[PDB]
Amino acid sequence: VLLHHKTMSIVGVLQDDADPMVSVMKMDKSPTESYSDIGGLESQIQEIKESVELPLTHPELYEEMGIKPPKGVILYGAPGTGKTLLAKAVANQTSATFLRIVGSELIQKYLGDGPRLCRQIFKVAGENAPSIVFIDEIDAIGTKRYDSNSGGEREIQRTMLELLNQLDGFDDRGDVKVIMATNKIETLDPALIRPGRIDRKILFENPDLSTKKKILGIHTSKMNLSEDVNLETLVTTKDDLSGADIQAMCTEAGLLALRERRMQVTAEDFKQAKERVMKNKVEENLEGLY
Amino acid sequence: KPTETYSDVGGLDKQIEELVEAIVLPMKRADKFKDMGIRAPKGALMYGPPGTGKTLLARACAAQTNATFLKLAAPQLVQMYIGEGAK
Amino acid sequence: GYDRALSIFSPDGHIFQVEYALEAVKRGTCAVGVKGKNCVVLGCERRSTLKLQDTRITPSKVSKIDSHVVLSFSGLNADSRILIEKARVEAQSHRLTLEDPVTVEYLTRYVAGVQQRYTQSGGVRPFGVSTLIAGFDPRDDEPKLYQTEPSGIYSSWSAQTIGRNSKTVREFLEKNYDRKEPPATVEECVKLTVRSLLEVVQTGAKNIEITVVKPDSDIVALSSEEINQYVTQIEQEKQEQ
Amino acid sequence: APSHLWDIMGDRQRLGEEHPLQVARCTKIIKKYVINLKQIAKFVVGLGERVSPTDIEEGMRVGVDRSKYNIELPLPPRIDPSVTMMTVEEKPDVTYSDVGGCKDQIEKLREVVELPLLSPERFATLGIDPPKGILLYGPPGTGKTLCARAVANRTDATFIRVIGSELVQKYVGEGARMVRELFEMARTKKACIIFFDEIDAVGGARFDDGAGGDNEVQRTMLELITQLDGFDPRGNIKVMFATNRPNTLDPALLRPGRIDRKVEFSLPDLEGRANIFRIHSKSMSVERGIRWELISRLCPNSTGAELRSVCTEAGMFAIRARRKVATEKDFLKAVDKVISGYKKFSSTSRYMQYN
Amino acid sequence: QLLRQLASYYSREQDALFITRLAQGLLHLGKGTMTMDVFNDAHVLNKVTLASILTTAVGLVSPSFMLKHHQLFYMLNAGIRPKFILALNDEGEPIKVNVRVGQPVLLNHGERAELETDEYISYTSHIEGVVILKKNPDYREEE
Numbered sequence A: 001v002l003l004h005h006k007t008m009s010i011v012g013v014l015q016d017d018a019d020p021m022v023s024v025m026k027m028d029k030s031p032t033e034s035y036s037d038i039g040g041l042e043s044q045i046q047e048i049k050e051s052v053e054l055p056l057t058h059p060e061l062y063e064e065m066g067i068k069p070p071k072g073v074i075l076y077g078a079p080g081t082g083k084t085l086l087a088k089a090v091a092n093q094t095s096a097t098f099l100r101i102v103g104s105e106l107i108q109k110y111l112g113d114g115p116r117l118c119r120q121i122f123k124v125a126g127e128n129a130p131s132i133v134f135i136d137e138i139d140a141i142g143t144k145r146y147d148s149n150s151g152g153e154r155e156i157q158r159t160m161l162e163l164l165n166q167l168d169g170f171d172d173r174g175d176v177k178v179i180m181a182t183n184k185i186e187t188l189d190p191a192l193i194r195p196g197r198i199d200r201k202i203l204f205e206n207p208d209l210s211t212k213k214k215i216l217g218i219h220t221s222k223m224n225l226s227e228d229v230n231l232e233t234l235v236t237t238k239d240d241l242s243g244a245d246i247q248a249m250c251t252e253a254g255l256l257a258l259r260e261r262r263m264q265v266t267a268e269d270f271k272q273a274k275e276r277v278m279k280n281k282v283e284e285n286l287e288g289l290y
Numbered sequence B: 001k002p003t004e005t006y007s008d009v010g011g012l013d014k015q016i017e018e019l020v021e022a023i024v025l026p027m028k029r030a031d032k033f034k035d036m037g038i039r040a041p042k043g044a045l046m047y048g049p050p051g052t053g054k055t056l057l058a059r060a061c062a063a064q065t066n067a068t069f070l071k072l073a074a075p076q077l078v079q080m081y082i083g084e085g086a087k
Numbered sequence C: 001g002y003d004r005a006l007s008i009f010s011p012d013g014h015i016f017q018v019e020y021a022l023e024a025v026k027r028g029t030c031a032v033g034v035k036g037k038n039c040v041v042l043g044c045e046r047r048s049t050l051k052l053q054d055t056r057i058t059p060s061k062v063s064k065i066d067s068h069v070v071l072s073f074s075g076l077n078a079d080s081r082i083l084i085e086k087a088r089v090e091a092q093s094h095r096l097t098l099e100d101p102v103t104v105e106y107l108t109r110y111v112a113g114v115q116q117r118y119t120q121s122g123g124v125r126p127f128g129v130s131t132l133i134a135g136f137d138p139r140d141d142e143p144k145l146y147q148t149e150p151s152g153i154y155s156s157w158s159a160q161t162i163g164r165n166s167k168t169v170r171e172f173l174e175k176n177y178d179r180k181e182p183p184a185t186v187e188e189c190v191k192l193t194v195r196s197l198l199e200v201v202q203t204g205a206k207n208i209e210i211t212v213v214k215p216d217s218d219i220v221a222l223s224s225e226e227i228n229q230y231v232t233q234i235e236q237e238k239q240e241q
Numbered sequence D: 001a002p003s004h005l006w007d008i009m010g011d012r013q014r015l016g017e018e019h020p021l022q023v024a025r026c027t028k029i030i031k032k033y034v035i036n037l038k039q040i041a042k043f044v045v046g047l048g049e050r051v052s053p054t055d056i057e058e059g060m061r062v063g064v065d066r067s068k069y070n071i072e073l074p075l076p077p078r079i080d081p082s083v084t085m086m087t088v089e090e091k092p093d094v095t096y097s098d099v100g101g102c103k104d105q106i107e108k109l110r111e112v113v114e115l116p117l118l119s120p121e122r123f124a125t126l127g128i129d130p131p132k133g134i135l136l137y138g139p140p141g142t143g144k145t146l147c148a149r150a151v152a153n154r155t156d157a158t159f160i161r162v163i164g165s166e167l168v169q170k171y172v173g174e175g176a177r178m179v180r181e182l183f184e185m186a187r188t189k190k191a192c193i194i195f196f197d198e199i200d201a202v203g204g205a206r207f208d209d210g211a212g213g214d215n216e217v218q219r220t221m222l223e224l225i226t227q228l229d230g231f232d233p234r235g236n237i238k239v240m241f242a243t244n245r246p247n248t249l250d251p252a253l254l255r256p257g258r259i260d261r262k263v264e265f266s267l268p269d270l271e272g273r274a275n276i277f278r279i280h281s282k283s284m285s286v287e288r289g290i291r292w293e294l295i296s297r298l299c300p301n302s303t304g305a306e307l308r309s310v311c312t313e314a315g316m317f318a319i320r321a322r323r324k325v326a327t328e329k330d331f332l333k334a335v336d337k338v339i340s341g342y343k344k345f346s347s348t349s350r351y352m353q354y355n
Numbered sequence E: 001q002l003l004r005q006l007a008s009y010y011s012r013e014q015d016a017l018f019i020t021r022l023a024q025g026l027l028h029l030g031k032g033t034m035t036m037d038v039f040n041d042a043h044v045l046n047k048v049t050l051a052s053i054l055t056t057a058v059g060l061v062s063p064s065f066m067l068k069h070h071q072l073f074y075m076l077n078a079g080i081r082p083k084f085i086l087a088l089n090d091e092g093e094p095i096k097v098n099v100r101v102g103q104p105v106l107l108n109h110g111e112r113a114e115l116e117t118d119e120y121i122s123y124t125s126h127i128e129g130v131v132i133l134k135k136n137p138d139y140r141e142e143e
Helices: A042-057 A060-065 A083-094 A113-127 A154-166 A209-219 A231-237 A243-260 A267-281 B013-027 B030-036 B055-064 C016-026 C077-097 C104-120 C166-176 C186-197 C224-239 D002-009 D104-112 D114-118 D144-155 D174-188 D215-228 D270-281 D293-298 D304-314 D328-339 E003-009 E016-027 E053-057 E072-079
Strands: A073-076 A099-102 A132-136 A177-181 A200-203 C031-035 C040-045 C062-066 C069-075 C129-136 C143-148 C154-156 C159-162 C208-214 C218-221 D021-029 D033-036 D042-045 D061-065 D071-074 D133-136 D159-163 D193-197 D238-242 D261-263 E086-088 E130-132
Touching (some): A042 A060, A042 A083, A042 A177, A042 A200, A083 A132, A113 A132, A113 A154, A209 A231, A209 A243, A231 A267, A243 A267, B013 B055, C016 C129, C031 C143, C031 C166, C031 C186, C040 C129, C062 C077, C069 C077, C069 C208, C077 C104, C077 C129, C104 C129, C104 C143, C104 C154, C129 C159, C129 C208, C143 C159, C166 C186, C208 C224, D104 D114, D104 D144, D104 D261, D114 D144, D133 D144, D144 D159, D144 D193, D144 D238, D270 D293, D293 D328, D304 D328, E053 E072
Parallel strands (some): A073 A177, A073 A200, A099 A132, A132 A177, D133 D238, D133 D261, D193 D238
Antiparallel strands (some): C031 C159, C040 C208, C062 C069, C069 C129, C208 C218, D021 D033, D021 D061, D033 D042, D061 D071
16 A cells, blocks of 8 residues: 555555566466477367367357356376477467466475465466466475475375365356376375366377377478488387477487588488487386286 | 352262362462471373363362462464563 | 285275276287187287287287187286186196086186186285187087176177277277178188277287187187288278278 | 545544554553553553543553554454455355255254354253354265355355465464464354364374474364363354364364264265256256156266266267257266266275275 | 345335346346347348337336336337347258357257358358258268
8 A cells, every 4th residue: 555654644555567476477478389289189189178278269158058167177198298288289279368387386395385375376367367277297295305395294285285175165257277287197186186176087198100190290390301201201110109209309300410500301310310219218118018 | 250160060079179189278278288297289280081171170170269260271372483482 | 825805895886906907908908809600700919019029939819728719818918827827727627527628608707707716815916817718619610709807707799809999999890890690701700800900000910910710629820921911902992992 | 536525524634643543452451551562662551532441451452642642542453464354255156055965964054053043042942052063074075165155155144264274374383373363253253154174284183203393283273172162161153174084183173072063974875866967957958858867877876076077078078979968868978988987096086085 | 246236225215126127137138048239240220229228228117217107118129139040951851050159069940150150052152041051963961
């Protein structure tokens, strides 16, 4: 507010300008990442579009139907399936507020500040626009190995149950969407999900030889390739690879041609790129059966 | 003075006579205690099962005796300001 | 030894050691098979990630329990060797005790009955593998195809698949294949299994193993060149139609 | 426009010195008043012109003039906490008729809460004591928080929703003050409702020999129990304890005398789950001639969270499955989807009843 | 939030119960799926709607403004223009088209749509309203 010097009387209220306090809120300047780059996943792309983008873009479908729209979707799958870029392309066409939070920031060093942070995340986001709370790669409270910020077993129950009350005790008109994704959701407390709020569950698997042909053409669209490079030949050599491993070979092939400063990448760069990815970047999983 | 007295309990006379010899009789018979040469007890531990407990009789001690009572809560003695809880 | 129980009823009424064991089958190689009037065909795939595997020295994915009946499973390979060995010993034990060749009906209820013991036996865990028993009874030409689930429930099926991408193949076998008019020739039974493997194997050759079961204790295993012969004829009638 | 009318009366309320008062809490009353300022300064004062002698009480904020200290106007105490001002909600959206089923989890709550508030003279004839506290835990996913909001609608009074993690602050000992903040409004605002959510993070003895940082949380209940039932039985309103883990709580908290009515939620049966789809049948789109008793029968025993997911997902099949409204065929597809498809892992229902 | 703040006027006026709920029912007129607009795709100004809302603005009820009667606000029922789309063939047999709107998805004769055109060929303009769908012998897609 605004006081007075002599009379010490309130002159009026002073609103906070230049953004709502904390500016790390990920206001999304909208680099405009389209759906053409995530193409090939369209089987699972239209799944999240109907439960997230559809009620925001076309609210008349759910309002006239009478059903309540879901508050989000949980994602599970092996790393490299494009779970990070799936939610990024959705917020582009909606042109609304969207948040990106790292799961490791839910717990702090001071005791009691963990649940205090989770209160301010949904409070500020819910005041301005039909925002969306997206927390990616949640390792929170498992395999601790933390000397500094470890709060014992008391921080476990306060921080997690604070997020559950935001989807239960916190009232909302349906404009707040919560989407959680990570590598393994089994280590997390299943009571935190409460799948009466989230009716959508999307899984992910490794693409086949037909899908990798579309993904390879995406990264090579802006890349200059020579005439001796075949797209179907590189896909055939791909064995047990995800969407991130395909871009890894396209990036490694670009670095080899960058050292020699070649506009069109020759076929010799793809031969040395696939050998380095399958060696270091691609490690044999602990599954091991068959 | 509270509204709770010793007439609201029963069958507890075994443990009632022991509480009278702690915070009750020295409020009166202390003059007789100095003749025997003993000293009045400076306190008695009050506990029980994980439940309500004897607090119902704690009001009767501050009622029938009609003496000065001071209620001090242990969990109210811990504060963020150092030294204020000690004062 | 170990006397502590494992399988425990969930508060929903199910069992954790059962449902969690069924996920091992869905993560394994898909095993699909069909049966005709005069013949029975059991297809099986292999792991396409691993290479440099000689077919001759590698044990066949379809285990032969008896001359007239074989077993093609899908699931944990560690729990499958226990069922294969104990089913073959009982096959000879049945010939010793009753002096009768075993039947496909008795072999399925035995393997499924043994699985019911480990679920009910404290100190052991259920099998994480599902076996498919198909063969012909002695002096009988009627096809017998029985499914054995890790939970112990067994049933007969005209066309059934287990393993990964099972629901995709099951929906394909209902519309394309009809149980009222099964094919009476062996060539049509082999081409039917190949059509179900096109959506799983996904353009592969050495990873496909098809076992043909015929009456009178006749078993002919299709080689690598014989399997690819039926694949070429189907691909020509697929994209063109 | 409103600023013009306030500038006329602003001559006496600005130029003259009245409002510039220094507010401080009074300590000793001699009938000389010893009052300590916010700057830690002690002084002596007395009554004013219009000040009544009975208005000044021990431990109350009393504004005094900064130049010549004198009592002018009294103020309500406990002005420091700003947290409990936002804990009171108004007009919850969930109504009393939103809770489905004819079972005993409804009538038992209204008799120990809504009955003494609406008709306090009913139990006065028998001369009994209405239950101060209640007990609602149940399995996760039954909508227990929805039943707490249904009571606040019929009550038409102040409702207070307290989060279990809110009681624990960033300082040691501040959580003890957070307890009295809730009970102070009980005497100030009569006939209100307080509700605790997720008390498992607070309650329990947990003893000593553990990690050692656990002694701060166990003192919150000892402050909460003292403020509930202390040496002086001070209480008016109803207290509601709720969490998802009744087994991990304090075995003293699990015994009566702070609580009388104890109701645990259960999974609705075939007759119970039928009413779950009947309250949702008035919403969405229901085809004429469809029997909802067969859908709840094919669905196994599950919490109400997964029961409402059937009606919600049924509308999703109107797009990909090429359907106008929700038909019986889409209901059967939801059985293998909403239920059988979503079981997998990370499905609670009755999975976690304990830890 | 706006319609719930009028509860303070029931004490000052005994007729406020009907006045506050009169315009609320007019908002829900037509089961919420109908409205009143003087514009369309052809830009045709309709004087019937202008002869209803403008006349019922002043003197809505009897106590409003001067002394009036209760028959003045019934003129709004004549300006109802519901939105609909119909597709026939010859004798009126329905034909399924592809339209995604609010209730629905892939509608046909007997439902409504708002600002959408299907992929099926009717005759020429392929617009809303009542149209007749005819297909060529080369590519023919029908119900």
